[PDB]
Amino acid sequence: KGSFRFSYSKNETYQLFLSYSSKKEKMFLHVKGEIHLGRFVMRNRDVVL
Amino acid sequence: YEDKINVGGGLSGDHCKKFGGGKTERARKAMAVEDIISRVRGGSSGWSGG
Numbered sequence: 001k002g003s004f005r006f007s008y009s010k011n012e013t014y015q016l017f018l019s020y021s022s023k024k025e026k027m028f029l030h031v032k033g034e035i036h037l038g039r040f041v042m043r044n045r046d047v048v049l
Numbered sequence: 050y051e052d053k054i055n056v057g058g059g060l061s062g063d064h065c066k067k068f069g070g071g072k073t074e075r076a077r078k079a080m081a082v083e084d085i086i087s088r089v090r091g092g093s094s095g096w097s098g099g
């Protein structure tokens with residue numbers, strides 16, 4: 001009498017996950033204002049001190 | 050099969066494969082430029098600037 005038995009089982013599970021995110025914002029500005037009143041022109045020559 | 054003498058035979062085969070791929074890309078951009086200029090030669094010391 002003879003009876004042989006064999007059993008083999010394999011099991012594999014791999015998982016990979018990757019995520020990347022980037023956000024950027026920039027704001028640079030300038031404002032200016034001048035309220036002028038009056039202008040003068042100094043005489044160049046024949047000047048008193 | 051078995052006749053005058055006995056003969057034994059056994060075979061088994063099983064294979065399984067599973068592949069996976071996932072990709073996602075997102076991008077967003079916005080730009081706005083607003084400039085205001087005002088020149089007034091009114092003729093008032095204060096009110097022209099005001």
Ligand SMILES: *[C@@H]1O[C@H](CO)[C@@H](O)[C@H](O)[C@H]1NC(C)=O
Binds near residue numbers: 006061062
């Ligand atoms: C024979 O192989 C199958 C897969 O091919 C398996 O499911 C079963 O368990 C195996 N038999 C024994 C007794 O392990």
Ligand SMILES: *[C@@H]1O[C@H](CO)[C@@H](O)[C@H](O)[C@H]1NC(C)=O
Binds near residue numbers: 010011012013065
């Ligand atoms: C093992 O392999 C079987 C294929 O027969 C599959 O269904 C099962 O999900 C696998 N086990 C794992 C933990 O993934």
